[PDB]
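Help! Submission page says 'invalid entity' but I think these are all valid:
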Amino acid sequence: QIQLVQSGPELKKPGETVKISCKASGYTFTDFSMHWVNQAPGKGLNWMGWVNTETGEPTYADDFKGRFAFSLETSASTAYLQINSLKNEDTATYFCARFLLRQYFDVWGAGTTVTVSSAKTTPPSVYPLAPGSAAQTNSMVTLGCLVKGYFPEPVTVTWNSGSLSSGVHTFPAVLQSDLYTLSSSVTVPSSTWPSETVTCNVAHPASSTKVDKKIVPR
Amino acid sequence: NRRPQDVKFPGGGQIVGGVYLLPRRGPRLG
Amino acid sequence: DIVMSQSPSSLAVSAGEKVTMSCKSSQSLLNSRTRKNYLAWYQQKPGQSPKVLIYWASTRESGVPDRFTGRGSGTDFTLTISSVQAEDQAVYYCKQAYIPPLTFGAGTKLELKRADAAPTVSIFPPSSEQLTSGGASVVCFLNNFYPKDINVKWKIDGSERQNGVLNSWTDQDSKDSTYSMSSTLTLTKDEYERHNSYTCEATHKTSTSPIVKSFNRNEC
Amino acid sequence: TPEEPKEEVTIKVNLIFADGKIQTAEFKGTFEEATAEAYRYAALHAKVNGEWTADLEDGGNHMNIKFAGK
């Protein structure tokens, strides 16, 4: 299928340089102009510029002139977004969208979220939240999972490797003292627990860690 | 924006901006 | 530079109703020659990337409900989702591409309205694992309630605590259109074991009396 | 940045239709340009829902808007 696959989350300190990538699969990387859009955390989207994928010629918007660099590795159906002398303001996530002569973006990439900061990467301690030794039954049990004390903001979360998607509420991260915390809850039928097993798959692409805490009763 | 420093007239392949387009009647490089 | 302005900001409509959004441009977006308007509508769900809905200010992109409609020309354009559903919750953007740089409106959030639901509250004591390391955090899960406004409180042995609790809320559920918030009370193991009862109280628009989930350390 | 004091605010709005339905909306921006942005929207709607009227309050902050219908 036509698709764009970007690099991973990046955590650089102020002043550090960074290069995120956008792999083009599914079409001919040289027929469409590839653009780069950014979204400040909680803000709208902003057109940064675009690289001619046939000339190499890159066009930049003013708000993003100097410090930013578009390029590509034509031989690899890949385009690269570089940012030098990084500032805390530069924190956000960057997309790369294929552009048509009809003047729109028919395909984006999951976007690469870079976060500038001085704090150091720290693994997320993961704890299982099972209903303590109490509560009737009501034929509907709500399990938990508490991720905590980690940094590099992104820590994707799922249950039973994705097999469990319904009844799932994973909450947004929350920063306190340079460390975030996030909780996620599943709510399965009583009959399926502790009958069948339930574990929360939690990853943190920075500390390069990953924990599959299986929730056992108390 | 094309490529040799100047700012207006030839071109037409990988375009950005609807005002620069003309109706289908030619080949070009894209 | 063409300045895009979207209206309104947020917008709450019940399922089934047809909603309408406006998008004005700094200047004309009509190419007199191609005779096309270069305004596209993008829909972007929480955490996802943007998803093109309409282009040429009117033409609907492939694989899209006739429910989404784009009318307009020049500077005055509007998007109209007829018969709105929960699967439409997102932020909608109009981007002009008539003349660089390309620009987007500030985005118009589309929320959904429904019957006030009571939050189902759950409480969980500090896990053996966490305690194992002088740390104790209590978690309460106020899930699937409506409206989105809700207040929470924590009591350690009848007493109310304010320091140490961190709160999170989720975007409207892509299915029931309700809301979920999470409060977790953190503190030291050296503390947690000096007190017995831990109970969090949820106060919602669906009542004058709060929902109360509690547990007593001398029973776990 | 033009600088010098003058913030933004939130204009809560009730969209009450003749058909009996109700929609909500918020218009954010500079007092004047938003209260207007609102009127505009309201106008933009009466296009198919009848002429509109209103009962401002909260100092123009909160706003209700009935669409006469047709």
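Support: the input was valid. A stray whitespace character was the problem, and the output above is from the cleaned input. The CA atoms of residues 203 and 209 of chain C lie 7 Å apart.
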